[PDB]
Amino acid sequence: AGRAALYKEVYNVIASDGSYVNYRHMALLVDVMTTQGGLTSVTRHGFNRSNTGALMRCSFEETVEILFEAGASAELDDCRGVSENVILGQMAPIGTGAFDVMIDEESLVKYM
């Protein structure tokens, strides 16, 4: 019920001036803040303090603070995120990079 009220409040500010933004965008942000258990702040201590790969988190304010926690607690960055593949300098698993492409020898002969 809390998230349903949260959407009403977010949508009411977008409606106040500048109608409109599609339900999909605000309901995603709202579902992000509530698919946690309670309410999640969109700040350095709210969302940024989560079970996320250390490199993704250090790129938002608490940089060396989080990187010290990463080493002291022996955290492992999964390399599955957007941010950690940008730092590594690899084709990130986003749209074009979310699938791999192989060549088929069965098809190579078929077409000559």
């Binding site: 001036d17 599609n22 995603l28 942000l29 803040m33 969109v42 995120g81």
Partner: protein, 269 residues
């Protein structure tokens, strides 16, 4: 903050809105699973209007002299009269149409009919009447079994989630609901002949063009969605030039959460 909070979020290949770690935020993107660009503000005619006009515009009664279809609309309009087997499905059609009005009034309690939904049926029928040059003088080539069955057979083809088990099949039915409610509203057995005058050749084309435009309107796996949403909410906030708190100072409270006054005026009824 918004853009950094929703970087990881992306529509996966199994129509589910997950992230980097793999936690689920939404099971179907924005509840319907459509690429936001292929949507138009469409009107649901089953929710709006009086019960007298709704019963007049949609109720089909072959077992009556004044509530039947005139043979100038149907090719077989006189041999379809007094048919009990054909009225069984025309009762089944109107019993689903009266269910739609009661369910829609539960969803949109405010009474508004114009809502954004995929596939512009409004124009798909407007172009069919021009593409085939259909005249209002001569009767159609289709019958009642062709309309009421063809409309229901199309509803199966409109796939969002690729099913096999009880969960995915029920999630598929839940995903369409509001769209097929509009489809039942627009392709009613009476409406197809009374207002549109669709020939069997042009009707089969309209059903396929609806299926084709719907499968085009489905979200593309790889769409960054969260990144898209983060910018789609943050951009209008930049142009907030226009005694309760509103605009950007109120927008900080809704992000911060944030147990301070400003204007906590609760509403009692």
């Amino acid at each position: 903050r918004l853009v950094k909070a929703l970087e990881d979020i992306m529509v996966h290949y199994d129509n589910t809105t997950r992230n980097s770690l793999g936690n689920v935020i939404q099971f179907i993107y924005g509840e319907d699973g459509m690429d936001a660009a292929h949507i138009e503000k469409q009107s649901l005619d089953t929710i709006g209007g009086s019960d007298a006009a709704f019963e007049k515009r949609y109720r089909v009664d072959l077992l009556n002299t004044d509530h039947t279809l005139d043979p100038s609309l149907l090719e077989s309009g006189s041999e379809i009269l007094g048919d009990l087997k054909l009225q069984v499905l025309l009762d089944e059609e109107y019993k689903q149409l009266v269910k739609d009005r009661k369910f829609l009034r539960e969803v949109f309690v405010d009474g508004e009919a114009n809502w954004p939904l995929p596939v512009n049926i409004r124009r798909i029928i407007q172009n069919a009447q021009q593409t085939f040059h259909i005249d209002h003088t001569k009767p159609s080539d289709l019958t009642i079994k062709d309309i009421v069955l063809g409309v229901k057979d199309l509803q199966e083809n409109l796939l969002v989630l690729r099913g096999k088990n009880e969960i995915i099949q029920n999630a598929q039915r839940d995903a369409v609901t509001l769209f097929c409610c509009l489809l039942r509203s627009r392709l009613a057995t009476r409406r197809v002949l009374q207002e549109y005058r669709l020939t069997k050749q042009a009707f089969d084309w309209v059903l396929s063009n609806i299926e084709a435009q719907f499968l085009r309107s489905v979200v593309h796996p790889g769409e960054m969605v969260g990144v898209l949403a983060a910018q789609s909410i943050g951009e209008p906030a930049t142009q907030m030039t226009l005694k309760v708190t509103s605009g950007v100072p109120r927008l900080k409270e809704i992000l911060n959460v944030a147990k301070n006054m400003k204007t906590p005026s609760l509403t009692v009824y």
